[PDB]
Amino acid sequence: SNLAIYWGQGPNQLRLSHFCQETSLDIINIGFINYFPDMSPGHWPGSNFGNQCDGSVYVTNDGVVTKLLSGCHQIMEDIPICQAAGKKVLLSIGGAYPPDQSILSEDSAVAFATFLWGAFGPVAEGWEGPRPFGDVVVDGFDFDIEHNGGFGYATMVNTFRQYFNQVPERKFYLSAAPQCIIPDAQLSDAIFNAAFDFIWIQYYNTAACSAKSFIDTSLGTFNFDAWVTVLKASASKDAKLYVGLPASETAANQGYYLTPDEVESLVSTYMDRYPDTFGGIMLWEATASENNQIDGAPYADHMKDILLH
Ligand SMILES: CNC(=O)NC(=N)Nc1ccccc1
């Protein structure tokens, strides 16, 4: 079972090459493309990577100043190291801030997909768009849509997967990151109507189905079961489900963090019930895990031992 984590939005983060050297980590999601074309200057998507990148943004063939970052030099340098180390690197779409971003048509969702594929996918001839990370090719795209409904996303997923299928030699990945409440307002249409390789339900910040509601069953009702049942119905039936967790008490709202012993008792129960769908743990996020050093190692290292034990 696999350990996925988020990097990109950590206060004072170290550079991604620190995390590339963390052997426990099998997947790293880079957040975020957070400005969508429909409300962003030029219809270009924009990006934000916390402290990373020199602050420069592309301007278009029209002189339009965009929201995309053009000098992300450490990330370009660092994504190949991660991949040279066995790790899959997915570029994440959305995130928490700002909360006023969405997709308005099926056309803009095909264009959004196509722009990301040209931009961060394989190097391609006729592509006359940006290459924010140079000749690096990501392994996939993560959908962390946490605002404004689910319109457009199954289309973006199938459009992506349409593109994947032309590169038969290489294997590319689609994941999503719902919150616990079923149905997820952002991603249930996506999950149902398209094939996600991985899905990591965020089990923090919502009381009625939080991971901590497994340890304290008075807080809400941990619902991984209901989720295996919808997954079975869906176009993502072969998706691997992940229990999404905060890597430190200071990573999500108070009381969502579980101690390793609490995690283990979650994991050994749901790895055994659904050995065929259970996939692993996902952490929010990389920096909080760094700073949560338990006996000379970070939180993620202790998660991986749990999964192997
Ligand atoms: C994988 N996505 C996240 O972990 N999202 C997340 N933590 N969003 C967020 C929502 C409200 C406040 C802070 C962060």
Side-chain angles (χ1 to χ4, degrees), residues 6 32 92 95-97 142 144 146-147 177 179 200 202 204-205 251-253 282-285:
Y6 274 81
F32 286 110
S92 193
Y97 191 87
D142 171 78
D144 183 21
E146 318 163 341
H147 304 271
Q179 287 189 250
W200 8 83
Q202 321 187 51
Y204 37 109
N205 288 337
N253 290 3
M282 177 272 261
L283 299 163
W284 186 266
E285 50 79 57

Side-chain angles (χ1 to χ4, degrees), residues 61-83:
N61 307 323
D62 280 34
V64 186
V65 189
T66 72
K67 281 187 184 265
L68 210 48
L69 294 150
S70 50
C72 293
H73 300 93
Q74 308 192 169
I75 289 168
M76 169 171 76
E77 280 154 63
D78 286 6
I79 287 168
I81 311 171
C82 270
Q83 305 170 318

Side-chain angles (χ1 to χ4, degrees), residues 179-184 188 203 209 223-228 230:
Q179 287 189 250
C180 73
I181 300 187
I182 295 177
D184 184 79
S188 274
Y203 277 121
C209 34
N223 74 350
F224 195 88
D225 300 304
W227 273 110
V228 172
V230 174

